[PDB]
Design a protein around this ligand. Structure first.
Ligand SMILES: CC(C)[C@@H](NC(=O)[C@H](CS)NC(=O)CCC[C@H](N)C(=O)O)C(=O)O
Ligand SMILES: [Fe+3]
Length: 329
């Protein structure tokens, strides 16, 4: 028997406005969700997610094998030693069904001081040929800033929920330095679906991606309408309902660190489902040198002995560890 998680729908539209009490009522809902199973759906978010899905499908369904090698990250193409994060992540027919394309802050150019300094986790995005993929780069860059805007407002809700002033997180989330990323993931329909691409959980469930916590402050996720996610609870894994009109929001492990686990990073996994679908996360990451002072809203004095953690080190370590534990995607 598999139960179903309570995933509240939260109208986040007040977070874009100037009605402070309405913002507090959104914040209370974020607090309640974050203290329960974590996840909530942000609704009334203002982003055209139908166009996001359409433009993403057009890219996934038209990119050629040649273009995939030309854009491939270093894990697939030794010529591309600078691509640890950004680029194409290839499928392996018979072995690995998922494939994806990751891009970073469009302001990371050769002019940017973090690129000049060669700081880890900063890379210049790679893109397919414009004439072969008309409008794709422009769509993808616009989307980065659209979802940046939503995420900034969500971060105001999380700050208010934790008893802070509304810019407590968002002040560290800036277009000039954010390490945030978009990933356009394709999960294919395959007939036959190769068993080598399916993992078996300890509890017997067939999975496409094993349990993990997110490497993020928060994660702002669109998925097409195919149920697949499960969240761990003390009584076992519970199904998260799909909703292709909203964004599924959760805390990542940086939030758990800074709140002394008051808002935990929910453990979750991806069930195997033989269906063509999309998983389009935006990982809300701060800047490389961003440090948030930890606190514990359970203590009267709010004091935490947890050490302040630099975001860039957290991200570097976290992305490597996730690959080591859950496989190169
Ligand atoms: C759980 C979903 C969000 C999705 N999984 C994922 O996105 C998984 C787990 S959160 N995330 C990752 O692999 C980290 C990608 C980091 C990215 N290359 C970057 O450099 O920033 C899936 O559908 O498999
Ligand atoms: Fe995740």
């Amino acid at each position: 028997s598999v139960s179903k998680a309570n995933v509240p729908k939260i109208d986040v539209s007040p977070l874009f406005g100037d009605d402070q009490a309405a913002k507090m009522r959104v914040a209370q809902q974020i607090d309640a969700a974050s203290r329960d199973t974590g996840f909530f759906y942000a609704v009334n978010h203002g982003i055209n997610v139908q166009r996001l899905s359409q433009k993403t499908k057009e890219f996934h369904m038209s990119i050629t094998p040649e273009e995939k090698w030309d854009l491939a990250i270093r894990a697939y193409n030794k010529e591309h030693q600078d691509q640890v994060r950004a680029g194409y992540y290839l499928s392996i027919p018979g072995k690995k069904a998922v494939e994806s394309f990751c891009y970073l802050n469009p302001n990371f150019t050769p002019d940017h001081p973090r690129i000049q300094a060669k700081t880890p986790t900063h890379e210049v995005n790679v893109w397919p040929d414009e004439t072969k993929h008309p409008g794709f780069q422009d769509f993808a860059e616009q989307y980065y800033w659209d979802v940046f805007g939503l995420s900034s407002a969500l971060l105001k809700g999380y700050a208010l929920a934790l008893g802070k002033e509304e810019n407590f997180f968002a002040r560290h989330f800036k277009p000039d330095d954010t390490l945030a990323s978009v990933v356009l993931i394709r999960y294919p329909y395959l007939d036959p679906y190769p068993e080598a691409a399916i993992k078996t959980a300890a509890d017997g469930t067939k999975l496409s991606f094993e349990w993990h916590e997110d490497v993020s402050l928060i994660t702002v996720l669109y998925q097409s309408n195919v149920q697949n996610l499960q969240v761990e609870t003390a009584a076992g894994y519970q199904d998260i309902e799909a909703d292709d009109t909203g964004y599924l929001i959760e805390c990542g492990s940086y939030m758990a660190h800074l709140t002394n686990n008051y808002y935990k990073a929910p453990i979750h996994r991806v069930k195997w489902v033989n269906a063509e679908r999309q998983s389009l996360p935006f990982f809300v990451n701060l800047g490389y040198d961003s440090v948030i002072d930890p606190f514990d809203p359970r203590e009267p004095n709010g004091k935490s002995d947890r050490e302040p953690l630099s975001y860039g080190d957290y991200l570097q370590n976290g992305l490597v560890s996730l690959i080591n534990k859950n496989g190169q995607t």
